[PDB]
Design a protein around this nucleic acid. Structure first.
Ligand SMILES: Nc1nc2c([nH]c(=O)n2[C@@H]2O[C@H](COP(=O)(O)OP(=O)(O)OP(=O)(O)O)[C@@H](O)[C@H]2O)c(=O)[nH]1
Ligand SMILES: [Mn+2]
Ligand SMILES: [Mn+2]
Ligand SMILES: [Mn+2]
Ligand SMILES: [Mn+2]
Ligand SMILES: [Mn+2]
Ligand SMILES: [Mn+2]
Ligand SMILES: [Mn+2]
Ligand SMILES: [Mn+2]
Ligand code: NA
Length: 327
DNA sequence: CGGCCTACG
DNA sequence: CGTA
DNA sequence: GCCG
């Protein structure tokens, strides 16, 4: 029996149904490109259910009773099982609309609404966007300028180098402050599109004003290509390489230690795992979860947590380590 | 039928 | 809107 | 698209 919410089941990084899940995730992506966030969610959830199964699905029988599998997702799986391809998926794959929306939305600073407008205006290539620079925000100009580098997978060697320079800047800005790797690398991923760090200090309140101080120190060592009181920064770093450098996306977030378990849980993801966990919290337990805390709206109180385990327990969920949150 | 995670920049 |  |  398979629970309905992704936060109720372990999802490891390596699973047994990548072909089927990849196909459903193409339909999810395409649904988002057409502005159907509900269809996107169902296709994402169905793909995630397959990631949590212990074995390869070989027969449509094995889908009976699984949550988020109805007529549409079941037919996709049945065609892939019978023919090795799903006609709808292939039609989406090969479409100019899908290919261009994927290309544009993968730019840092460009989402579906922006990409769709550009599509409707006839634009199709990165060079098209470069030829009309005034249509671009500062953030989009940075994303486009560094697009090549940002399309190169970030590896663990890059993470370790980046954590060192971030720890050095953090320690110069505030003694005793700490840096925790989050995001997909904390979940055990070998690669990523960025590196995510969570910064705090053991003495509540000492972290006030920290992120501007850290950013100024990084910028003075020549490490910042793009950034921007604030507590989150979605940056592009100039990461030194042997004889050169490459641009890397880095997310920095500062939290007071009282919020650290909630920030750690939120920023560790996966993104689907966290939306599911917040949905579960509100719809099943009547509690409101975010990366700052867990709120009881009836008593008007916040749950004091010392650990991620505490949060799972307050929500009545079996604890899942980060490596099992790869929903 | 309506809901679908979340808050900051 | 973007982070996504 | 699926579900309460
Ligand atoms: N703009 C952009 N987004 C990308 C790229 N690659 C990539 O995975 N993403 C987005 O980032 C997600 C996975 O990246 P990741 O390895 O950092 O995973 P993560 O859980 O740490 O994601 P997060 O840092 O957003 O929390 C994907 O779901 C996708 O939407 C890319 O080249 N460009
Ligand atoms: Mn397995
Ligand atoms: Mn259908
Ligand atoms: Mn057939
Ligand atoms: Mn990441
Ligand atoms: Mn990130
Ligand atoms: Mn805050
Ligand atoms: Mn409806
Ligand atoms: Mn619908
Ligand atoms: Na984007």
């Amino acid at each position: 029996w398979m629970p309905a919410y992704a936060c109720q089941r372990p999802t490891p990084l390596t699973h047994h149904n990548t072909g089927l899940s990849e196909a459903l995730e193409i339909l999810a992506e395409a649904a988002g490109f057409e502005g159907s966030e509900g269809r996107l969610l169902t296709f994402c959830r169905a793909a995630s259910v397959l990631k949590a199964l212990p074995s390869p699905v070989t027969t449509l029988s094995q889908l009976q009773g699984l949550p988020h599998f109805g007529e549409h997702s079941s037919r996709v799986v049945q065609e892939l099982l019978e023919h090795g391809v799903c006609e709808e998926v292939e039609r989406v794959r090969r479409s100019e609309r899908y290919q261009t929306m994927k290309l544009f939305t993968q730019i840092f600073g460009v989402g579906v609404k922006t990409a769709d407008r550009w599509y409707r205006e006839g634009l199709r290539t990165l060079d098209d966007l470069r030829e009309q620079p005034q249509k671009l925000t500062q953030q989009q100009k940075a994303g486009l300028q560094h697009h090549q580098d940002l399309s190169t997978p970030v590896l663990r060697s890059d993470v370790d180098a980046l954590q060192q320079v971030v720890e050095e800047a953090v320690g110069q800005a505030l003694p005793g402050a700490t840096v925790t790797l989050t995001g997909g690398f904390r979940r055990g991923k070998l690669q990523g599109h960025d590196v995510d760090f969570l910064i705090t200090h053991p003495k509540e309140g000492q972290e006030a004003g920290l992120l501007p101080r850290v950013m100024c120190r990084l910028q003075d060592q020549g490490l910042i290509l793009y950034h921007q009181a604030f507590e989150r920064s979605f940056c592009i770093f100039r990461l030194p390489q042997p004889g050169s450098w490459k641009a890397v996306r880095v997310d920095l977030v500062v939290a007071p230690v009282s919020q650290f378990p909630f920030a750690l849980l939120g920023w560790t993801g996966s993104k689907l795992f966290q939306r599911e966990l917040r949905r579960f919290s509100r719809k099943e337990k009547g509690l409101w979860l975010n990366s700052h805390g867990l709120f009881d709206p009836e008593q008007k109180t916040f749950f004091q947590a010392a650990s991620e385990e505490d949060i799972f327990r307050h929500l009545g969920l079996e604890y899942l380590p980060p490596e099992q949150r790869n929903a």
